[PDB]
Design a protein around this ligand. Structure first.
Ligand SMILES: Cn1nc(C(=O)NCCc2cocn2)c2cccnc21
Ligand SMILES: [Zn+2]
Length: 140
Protein backbone atom coordinates (compact mmCIF):
# COMPACT_ATOMS: atom_id res chain seq x y z
CA UNK A 1 0.00 0.00 0.00
CA UNK A 2 0.96 3.67 -0.35
CA UNK A 3 -0.03 7.01 -1.94
CA UNK A 4 1.47 10.43 -3.03
CA UNK A 5 -0.12 13.59 -1.61
CA UNK A 6 0.56 16.71 -3.72
CA UNK A 7 -1.63 19.89 -3.58
CA UNK A 8 -5.26 18.78 -3.31
CA UNK A 9 -4.53 15.43 -5.09
CA UNK A 10 -4.02 11.78 -3.93
CA UNK A 11 -2.17 9.45 -6.35
CA UNK A 12 -2.62 5.69 -5.78
CA UNK A 13 -2.33 2.37 -7.69
CA UNK A 14 -5.64 2.12 -9.64
CA UNK A 15 -6.00 -1.53 -8.40
CA UNK A 16 -5.84 -0.33 -4.75
CA UNK A 17 -8.17 2.74 -5.07
CA UNK A 18 -11.02 2.83 -2.48
CA UNK A 19 -14.79 3.65 -2.96
CA UNK A 20 -14.05 7.27 -1.85
CA UNK A 21 -11.20 7.54 -4.49
CA UNK A 22 -13.67 6.54 -7.27
CA UNK A 23 -16.43 8.87 -5.97
CA UNK A 24 -13.84 11.75 -6.00
CA UNK A 25 -12.03 10.67 -9.20
CA UNK A 26 -9.97 13.34 -11.03
CA UNK A 27 -8.24 11.03 -13.58
CA UNK A 28 -7.39 7.28 -14.05
CA UNK A 29 -5.68 5.15 -16.72
CA UNK A 30 -5.96 1.31 -16.50
CA UNK A 31 -3.00 0.81 -18.85
CA UNK A 32 -0.80 2.78 -16.34
CA UNK A 33 -2.30 1.25 -13.12
CA UNK A 34 -2.77 4.89 -11.86
CA UNK A 35 -5.68 6.79 -10.29
CA UNK A 36 -5.79 10.36 -8.91
CA UNK A 37 -8.59 11.54 -6.52
CA UNK A 38 -9.24 14.94 -4.88
CA UNK A 39 -8.54 15.67 -1.22
CA UNK A 40 -9.77 18.36 1.19
CA UNK A 41 -6.36 18.78 2.90
CA UNK A 42 -3.13 20.04 1.31
CA UNK A 43 -0.42 17.40 0.66
CA UNK A 44 3.32 17.85 1.26
CA UNK A 45 4.96 15.79 -1.52
CA UNK A 46 6.86 17.33 -4.49
CA UNK A 47 6.70 15.61 -7.89
CA UNK A 48 10.10 15.36 -9.61
CA UNK A 49 10.35 17.17 -13.04
CA UNK A 50 13.45 15.54 -14.51
CA UNK A 51 14.72 12.54 -16.50
CA UNK A 52 16.74 10.89 -13.60
CA UNK A 53 17.52 7.16 -13.86
CA UNK A 54 18.91 6.71 -10.27
CA UNK A 55 16.85 6.93 -7.07
CA UNK A 56 15.67 5.14 -3.88
CA UNK A 57 12.48 3.08 -3.37
CA UNK A 58 10.70 1.78 -0.24
CA UNK A 59 10.16 -2.03 -0.15
CA UNK A 60 7.60 -2.85 2.66
CA UNK A 61 8.32 -6.66 2.33
CA UNK A 62 11.91 -5.96 3.54
CA UNK A 63 11.23 -2.75 5.64
CA UNK A 64 14.14 -1.26 3.59
CA UNK A 65 14.87 1.68 1.26
CA UNK A 66 17.00 0.49 -1.70
CA UNK A 67 19.14 2.66 -4.01
CA UNK A 68 18.47 1.63 -7.64
CA UNK A 69 19.13 2.46 -11.33
CA UNK A 70 15.84 2.34 -13.33
CA UNK A 71 14.89 2.45 -17.02
CA UNK A 72 12.99 5.39 -18.72
CA UNK A 73 9.14 5.10 -18.79
CA UNK A 74 8.17 2.62 -21.59
CA UNK A 75 5.36 0.33 -22.89
CA UNK A 76 6.14 -3.16 -21.47
CA UNK A 77 4.34 -6.52 -21.49
CA UNK A 78 3.30 -7.47 -17.93
CA UNK A 79 2.10 -10.97 -16.99
CA UNK A 80 -1.29 -11.61 -15.38
CA UNK A 81 -1.91 -10.88 -11.67
CA UNK A 82 -5.00 -11.03 -9.36
CA UNK A 83 -5.91 -7.45 -10.60
CA UNK A 84 -5.28 -7.45 -14.39
CA UNK A 85 -5.00 -10.03 -17.19
CA UNK A 86 -1.62 -10.10 -19.04
CA UNK A 87 -1.30 -6.84 -21.02
CA UNK A 88 1.02 -4.00 -22.04
CA UNK A 89 1.46 -1.49 -19.19
CA UNK A 90 2.48 2.04 -20.27
CA UNK A 91 4.77 4.67 -18.62
CA UNK A 92 6.49 1.79 -16.69
CA UNK A 93 10.10 1.85 -15.41
CA UNK A 94 12.03 -1.30 -14.26
CA UNK A 95 14.90 -1.76 -11.71
CA UNK A 96 16.74 -4.88 -10.47
CA UNK A 97 15.35 -5.33 -6.96
CA UNK A 98 13.02 -7.27 -4.66
CA UNK A 99 9.25 -6.79 -4.65
CA UNK A 100 6.01 -8.63 -3.76
CA UNK A 101 2.39 -7.56 -4.63
CA UNK A 102 1.85 -5.87 -1.22
CA UNK A 103 4.83 -3.56 -1.99
CA UNK A 104 2.65 -1.65 -4.56
CA UNK A 105 2.34 1.99 -3.49
CA UNK A 106 5.93 2.22 -2.20
CA UNK A 107 7.47 5.47 -3.48
CA UNK A 108 10.45 5.78 -5.86
CA UNK A 109 12.25 9.14 -5.41
CA UNK A 110 15.26 11.02 -6.77
CA UNK A 111 17.01 14.29 -5.73
CA UNK A 112 14.14 16.28 -7.40
CA UNK A 113 11.18 14.61 -5.67
CA UNK A 114 8.72 11.75 -6.22
CA UNK A 115 9.29 9.83 -9.50
CA UNK A 116 6.66 7.07 -9.24
CA UNK A 117 5.07 4.22 -7.25
CA UNK A 118 5.70 0.42 -7.18
CA UNK A 119 3.14 -1.28 -9.51
CA UNK A 120 4.57 -4.54 -11.02
CA UNK A 121 7.31 -7.14 -10.39
CA UNK A 122 8.80 -10.61 -10.42
CA UNK A 123 11.95 -12.43 -11.60
CA UNK A 124 14.09 -10.07 -9.51
CA UNK A 125 12.76 -6.97 -11.32
CA UNK A 126 10.49 -4.31 -9.77
CA UNK A 127 8.31 -2.00 -11.90
CA UNK A 128 7.31 1.59 -11.07
CA UNK A 129 4.44 3.65 -12.58
CA UNK A 130 5.95 7.04 -13.58
CA UNK A 131 4.12 10.23 -12.50
CA UNK A 132 6.69 12.91 -13.65
CA UNK A 133 4.80 13.60 -16.92
CA UNK A 134 1.55 14.55 -15.06
CA UNK A 135 2.40 18.27 -15.00
CA UNK A 136 -1.13 19.18 -13.88
CA UNK A 137 -0.39 17.63 -10.41
CA UNK A 138 1.61 20.89 -9.60
CA UNK A 139 -1.08 23.50 -10.36
CA UNK A 140 -4.60 24.92 -9.57
C1 LIG B 1 5.53 -5.10 -6.95
N1 LIG B 1 4.76 -6.18 -7.55
N2 LIG B 1 3.48 -5.95 -7.98
C2 LIG B 1 2.97 -7.13 -8.31
C3 LIG B 1 1.51 -7.24 -8.70
O1 LIG B 1 0.95 -8.33 -8.71
N3 LIG B 1 0.91 -6.08 -8.99
C4 LIG B 1 -0.53 -5.99 -9.25
C5 LIG B 1 -0.87 -4.87 -10.23
C6 LIG B 1 -0.49 -5.16 -11.65
C7 LIG B 1 0.16 -4.40 -12.54
O2 LIG B 1 0.27 -5.09 -13.72
C8 LIG B 1 -0.33 -6.27 -13.44
N4 LIG B 1 -0.80 -6.38 -12.25
C9 LIG B 1 3.94 -8.18 -8.13
C10 LIG B 1 4.03 -9.56 -8.25
C11 LIG B 1 5.22 -10.19 -7.89
C12 LIG B 1 6.28 -9.42 -7.42
N5 LIG B 1 6.23 -8.08 -7.27
C13 LIG B 1 5.07 -7.50 -7.63
ZN1 LIG C 1 15.24 13.66 -10.68
Amino acid sequence: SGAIYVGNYRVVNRHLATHNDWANLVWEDSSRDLLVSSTTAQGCDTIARCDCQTGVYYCSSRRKHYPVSFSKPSLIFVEASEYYPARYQSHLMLAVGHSEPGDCGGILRCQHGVVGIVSTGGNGLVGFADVRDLLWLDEE
